[model samples]
Target: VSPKTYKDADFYVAPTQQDVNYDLVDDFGANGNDTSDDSNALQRAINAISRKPNGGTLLIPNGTYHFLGIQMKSNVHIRVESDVIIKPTWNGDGKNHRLFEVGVNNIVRNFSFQGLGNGFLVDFKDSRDKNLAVFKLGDVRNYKISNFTIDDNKTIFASILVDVTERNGRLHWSRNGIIERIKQNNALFGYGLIQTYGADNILFRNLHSEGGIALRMETDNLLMKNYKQGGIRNIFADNIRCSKGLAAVMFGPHFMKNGDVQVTNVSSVSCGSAVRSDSGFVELFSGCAQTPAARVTQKDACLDKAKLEYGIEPGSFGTVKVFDVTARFGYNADLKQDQLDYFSTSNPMCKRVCLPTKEQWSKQGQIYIGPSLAAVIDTTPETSKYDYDVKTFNVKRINFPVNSHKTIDTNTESSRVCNYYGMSECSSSRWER
Candidate 1:
């Protein structure tokens, strides 16, 4: 088959294709401004672009255009000006459902999409249906969707879904890629920013998702394979920050089973948890697997069967390094009364209990928290000076001044205390004999 010519393609819009500016829509007031017309700006653009042969740029100039859903056509670059904003109408009335329905080999970029029942529905029909098999990237190359703020209307209670099944069964379906820099903020409950399944060769960077869940992965086939090799690796989220949510980032079990995913410099302040890896293994410079000298205070010399059996392995493959990462609000180390009771029950025969446990706990008890609670409370005698050479790390408790009062003392040793009240400043102090 002769290659279809997409070079030097044309652009179109409403009534007149040549000079038909989108501002003439009902809601559009003159000079690229709109007042009350709810006519679908996106639909007009889609209708105009759909008529075009293919391989052209559909330019959306600066304006606030409201619409419902606009399915993408193959070989088209939807370029929304940096100042342009695309808002979706309501969904229940079946008027405004998806803002942009992406097709194979399409590029969406330099624009912001928000204010809808669902933000952008890539390929799937609704939030729950997974019927579409895969997307065909027909001559759509160098797809870029970036530098846009995608927020949800408070009325919309569901998540924004992206389906890549249009390309599911075919190897040829994987072509150019989808690149996006989506910034989300100010969302109500039960709303997620983006839900993706299926597309490949996608690069996502510099995302700030707040108020609701940031990103959720549903399939394993979309993961990017070998950063070194140019494979179908569907998604990559980097430099991501979430202020408040159930989870800053959540991936389905398939995230780990599919590709080698790397998450670095991801942080959360008021969110539920910073990061959670439900099914796969993540390699960190220093974590449960490795302990760097900066994080390690001393060696764990305690000899216990559980520690020997499950804690640290003896060979070169066994040791995991730790790093001293200073958290903004310090760490929480409080044990609940029930948890303490359970611990006591588990080790009924033990004479002393430790305070301020290690942040990372191994399956084997080889490594553990130093400066036992019994030792802190007794304060009667000094058995040994704080030894830095020891290969164990401990959470040190700091005493606060009596007169001064603060909401949260970062120096507090126990999160139990912080949770009950609050804390201010806490840091890790190394001790050596």
Candidate 2:
């Protein structure tokens, strides 16, 4: 075959060539913005589409249709018109479910969802609750959800979510999923702007949220011996903004085999955390965080093999430079080698970083952070900068940048102005690592 015009997955838009294969009003007796209980009609539409010999599409034209759940099959696509709204008509108790699900190659685009959020579970006498989402996906593959928005319904209980909760139930080993260009008003707690379990190769782009969680990954399962066979991996989330309550992105558990997750261009106003990671290796690049010194505070100095093993190689090969911090909330801009060492692999897993307070930030031509030392380059109970790479096996290369220049598997590190600031990369002044 020569080349199918679909070479690059650069843009995500609904297909137009196919005529409306199924219409809610024509065969299913469904009418938009009506109180005639469209649930039955909607279900029938999905089932009808699934039965087509070559699979078909369901055109959800503009208007509001109330329903409890929209289930799925394979090789189907949903084209939701810009004005369409799927209002939740159920009280949502006991898991008849959360308003969405899909199996394979199911594309849901350009729709707005209104719901009671986790309240759907609370009403059930429980509180609970993903394209792997135009709103949700679990163990699904070859899916895409774009240009979606949410009406949080003026309640904190109203929101949006994504999941990969199963490896074998109905959907399993999901891949090639995309959740892009979404706008939301809220989400549930412990839950996030989007959360997941066993998912991989999922991309979330240009999503804006008012609150709840901006983004979260499922990491508990991968903790001790967490492996490639489990947990989340290869997630790319970009241009996300969350307003309040909870982190803009709650990344971690960073257990064994869980990694290759990249996030860029994230911003939030007084978010609980711009990016709160209690685990290992999630790279954040180019963003504004209103919180004080966010990145410099959380980093594992050394991977304690006894506590958490070295599942896969960790740390970003590309330098992660964060600026636009709101400032003066947590630690100072300057961190010491001790604070740096308190975290890297020091038990002989590798050598600690050596300090070189060869300069001072307060000095006219000098710039660096460390104790004032005499006859010592950087001596307040100095640590090693490695000066040279450890270059040893059995050395778990751990480097957490508490905002980074006091870092290295062993630094005294950022790249903004020389390597003194920790973790930041190349700047205006004389630049060096």
Candidate 3:
């Protein structure tokens, strides 16, 4: 019972020493330096350091501050120092719009939103605000958000959102967490950076995004009831990065029960699927009433008895491990293709797991855009059952060097280089099935 130096191994534990200490500009007068509206004086210094019983520390120093929403409590600990910028006084529409909010309604414990020396910097670039969210966590537990730098250029809606909250009537999500060294800039292709709906033992480090998807482990999103009991299991991501962005790491478990992913060092350049599994289920009785005089009906009869007695579908999985993943691709004008086929143009998607022919630009020795690993299975209903239950995916040391450039139209079919989606001794006309 002696060791506790600032521990860090059993997955995040820092947040215990703060008996008292407020100061958001000397006991809440709030004027981080001029242009007023420090959001009710920093919510009155976080409501006096969350009624301090033994939980304290507000202290936001260094300079420029103008905030909003700002509601987070329980064992509060928001240090934020350095050159702290923060800007965003008003001009948001879609409800509350957020700049920081934890555990929406209840259940929040041992929180810590740190950002010391070179960390603090949340500049929304004069925000016109369109769904903006810089951290809208909910039902938290042993949490911690470190460093920080979200210089957003609009198009956000979720830069870091991990939800779930119903309090007294059950449903509480968000478990042991720790997000680290965050850095962002824009991001939108169905919400980006860190968007987790219902979470469990989490831990991510050094996340970076230039556009979208830095790590969206969505475990419930098919007309959400958020899957009754806990979804999105133990995840431990590391180093993840994206450039023009769309996928640095995305496992999207639509319709509950995600896995135990242990990603590492994933890096994507002209982004779009460096690592993507996608997960399934959707046509839940399609567009309404199953007829009983219609009140609310959408049946699947326990999803066809959990896939006919335990083949267990609904995006099932338990163990997944991705490591050293890397992708390269080219063309970067903000990653066009209508923003990665903006949710389907007849299933065009972010394609490019390895393309290099000639509409222009070339160099040779390639393996870009994708194919580090991919298991595609989206939204169900094209006659459902596209396989699930992957108790182990375990991809490792995947890289993609060689020139990786642009232009396309080399005759499609993933533009050559033997396609490959799971190799099967190659040649099935280049395989991508």
Candidate 4:
């Protein structure tokens, strides 16, 4: 499908059970009076949609709703209204901590998730063996997360993690997902904003990331192993801008097989380096041989021929192609004086060659040609009766040394003379005059 279809997809928000005019504080047991408390907003919202079918919408109205962490069920759409704001408490007790735990096939859209000690919008922790909290998509499919703003509340290890698993030599995941129009800003120290691991066919578009490391994809394959012959594909990024960050985007190691990965019209303004791609093998049109052992003869022969035609050569590494990119300032190592002189004198066919004057050579400790030569050098001398005749000479000479100690002055006798000064109280002498 075209990228515009995904960009223009309709947004959905879930519905609530409260009356149209019902006050959330009085009717839903919300802590309206106390600014320090947020008792039951998220819990009541989750309970409202627990008995419903998989595909349903839960809308958060336009108001400040205080809540602890909320668990998301399957096939549900949690929509945060445009003006609605959800803020978590700062207890650091880990009780009312996690914001949203999106189950398989869920959609989260159009709500601001912020204001917590460590605010995480979606937390999918499915493994008990490992101590890490990873978003494990176990057999879930067709999820979409779009149009949201996430603020990191000055906490360590706070991230939006999307992790898939390989169970018993077979991959299991929430496949074919879309993350679009998301903005992440104001993160804490030593924390990456968004991290995706082991999710496939994911598309991110119109993303604006600021003030932190933006996106990290680690150890994931977009396509399955059985289809490794044709390869997995379908990851696209368009019109994304990372205004300010230490590092804008980072691709991790072990990205073996995938579909075409296209980044078009993306820019980074105030980043340290725009994009950094670590060790990985990404296939755009066709998959190439990564290792020497993987190189094999193919049946069709065109695929193998094309792989050799465009692939990186043997015993060499790193292929990069940048098109229509411009940079204002770049760094380079310092050049020596002789190298600069070689570039200046080697241009023999240049029209004008004007060397520096003696005063300029003494000040700058070097000689440089001026812009115009005929203006500085008097080519036309005076020809009147009272005018003195001036002559120009060009001499060619070669010097040879027997003991490697040779000295030669390549100037005329009149030009080789130097001016001298003596003591303060010197008597008038013929040489001094």
Candidate 5:
């Protein structure tokens, strides 16, 4: 609870306790209450704890095992006790739904995949495959995914998905990670519970998600060419908590380029939009285009307008620091009309409604602090002055529900204008000319 926005020597330092364990039902002859298929006895106890050499601990003691695609090595450390329970025997045809596949093709380091208490469970909510994923880290670095409990419900991605992978042609991202005290439950509408794409110095602490989007630090569909030049940087989240989610912390690097971010203590109850900032597009065709086979035979070759200076530099926020934000608008619950019609069809030029209609929560719920915008980027006018170098303090919005034009939105200015969907307006020059 001490990061106002990074710089506590840049948070993260947990793994330290390795003495050679590797049990899985007594040294790999696995049988955790038989459902069979323990994935070759947990990949032979994760390949004998990644061939020892100073890397150990692959315990898993209680019961209920199953498992599918194991493959996670580099300095092994998987613990998991307290009535285990890891379901999933992968009936998801064409197998490998990633039950744990860190660094699929080379490069990985210090590990720590703990889950020691609270009835440790990874039950993919009665799986027939809800897109199974307990951990799919690629090209990893110093890792640590703490105290888990993810009984998935609606997931096409993310229980933990830090991206970056492209073997023989270079491209291996993922650095100094640590996702803390996790717990996901329901999760759907836009994937949830921890989705970092092309990470670096990551740290999302004490997280919780009862439904999608708890911290999806996005970087839009980076085509390829070595994982779109990778970038979702030095983030350091804290105490995030969402319920019936869709927005607890979402920052999409529309075209790519995100460095500094430092969220802290965010909360959203009947969630729909508590701390949103997504608005960036126009990458006509970019695999970070640097001669992708001569721009793929030059048909409609655009590749990130003006060489990644999408909106004159701010491709994706650099110094964002959302602090102590809070929101709540349960109005006796139940208001997910398909996520308010997908927040009004992804802000088709905004006008409002992402969750709020108990007679407009009895007239404006009142809880505006800062940050909120689900649409911006006019394709020009400097991408409509892309925003965020954000800095908020203790923002509260208890009964939350205000967007009929603006009872008060603090999106700042520079021709603000988010007119409704998730609300945020200041249209002085109406988005400048």
Candidate 6:
């Protein structure tokens, strides 16, 4: 609970390993892919593991375990080896409703949830019993999930897809978590990978998706919309590249005062609008964006209506400062030579270009480009309407091959936006991570 749970909180970080005791799901009567119901055995292990003094680890071998749902307890970590697929046999079909949930201080990795697109609802009470997500994070202390794949299977029409979790309204989660190298492909209904609530020091990165939206937003008071249900704060989104969906990302009408929210290193190939903001949010930003189009859409298109355009309601955010940021590729793994050369050539190295419009200035308060080479951006609370300023920092290269040393920056488009601006150049030294 570093800072999020308590001001002088414990240094909360996920554990690498659990105690030696092991309760294999097989022992509990689970027959993977054999059409056997292992839910009771799995649940018994999880419940028993919870009672362990320092928490314990549950192991699922290389097989398909069938279950209605999983309810994990605190101080537990689950590890599934390669070739392990956990098939959900239950749906909220009223006859066999199910879910897979985790509590505080937990980690889940190296597993697959097939045919589960239909579970996990944004609300617990969804009639469809949709809350049966492949993974639902709650409580928030000491959590980490990685190297897992979540996709749909052949069941009930076959189009069900979902996210890590999008339910946020009373889960005042706190501090230090990471979700990486996870793939959620071919999903339907469109939700975020991890739509959090009251985020505090969470890093979501290296995520690749081909279905639904990349990053869906979550907040405290979603119903009232901008009433600030503790509004999300202190989150960093890195390497969020998506190829399908209506929009690349939607920022929540989140944050009240200037909190830390950033969306960076994004490349959406055939996605719709780059960044869409919810109604009523207030924060200062420091970066530049050309278009949701990155470099493809420049000029008025960027600000008014383009790839990187704003999708906000008039006066939604009372008043706030925006950044001089770009959603373009400084370096994207997906970019080929042509796209790469175009990116580097269009902008200068070790520098940023920030340009403000005259009409925008006259009508709005004041918008200025940073130094050089930034994307076009529009935070719609007019200068006349809101007192605003664009923040700044040193311009540096995007992390290539994943750097050893690092720096940070953050901002918003919608509640889901997380930008990293003004990072000092990468440190050549080995981080030994």
Mind giving the per-residue lDDT tens digits that candidate 5 earns over 306-401? Answer: 445433232466887777777675422222332222333223343433333333233333221122322111111222444444555676766543
Task: Report how far off residue 325 is in candidate 3 (Å).
Answer: 27
How many clashes (backbone atoms < 3 Å, residues ≥3 apart in a chain or on different chains) does model 6 have? 47
TM-score of each: 0.46, 0.54, 0.35, 0.48, 0.33, 0.54
Write down the lDDT that model 3 would get: 0.61
lDDT of each: 0.34, 0.42, 0.61, 0.37, 0.63, 0.41
Candidate 3 global TM-score:
0.35
| Residue 234 accuracy (lDDT) in model 5 | 68
TM-score of candidate 2 on Cα atoms, chains taken together: 0.54
- For candidate 2, lDDT tens digit of each residue in 231-268? 55666666665554344554444332454565655555
Least accurate 10 contiguous residues by lDDT in model 6? 332-341
* Model 2: lDDT of residue 269: 50
Best by lDDT: 5
RMSD of each: 16.5, 15.6, 18.9, 23.4, 18.8, 14.9
> Which of the two candidates, 1 or 4, achieves a greater lDDT against the reference?
4
TM-score of 5: 0.33
Stretches of candidate 4 above 4 Å error?
1-40, 90-97, 104-140, 165-171, 188-191, 220-233, 254-259, 280-433
TM-score of structure candidate 1: 0.46
**Candidate 4, which ten residues in sequence have the lowest lDDT sum?**
370-379
lDDT of 3 by residue, 1-433 (tens): 1111222455557655777888788888888878777988887777677787778888888898888778888888888887889977776455647777888866678888889977989887777766678788888788889887887763546688787766666677678888888888755445567877777777887888776677877666332343355567777777788766566676756556665667766766656545655435432332333344222212356456545754445555477666665566433312322122222222233343333232211322222232322211122233334434322132222233333222121121332223233212322222211
Question: Residue 405's C-alpha lDDT in candidate 4?
Answer: 9
Candidate 4 — number of clashing residue pairs?
9
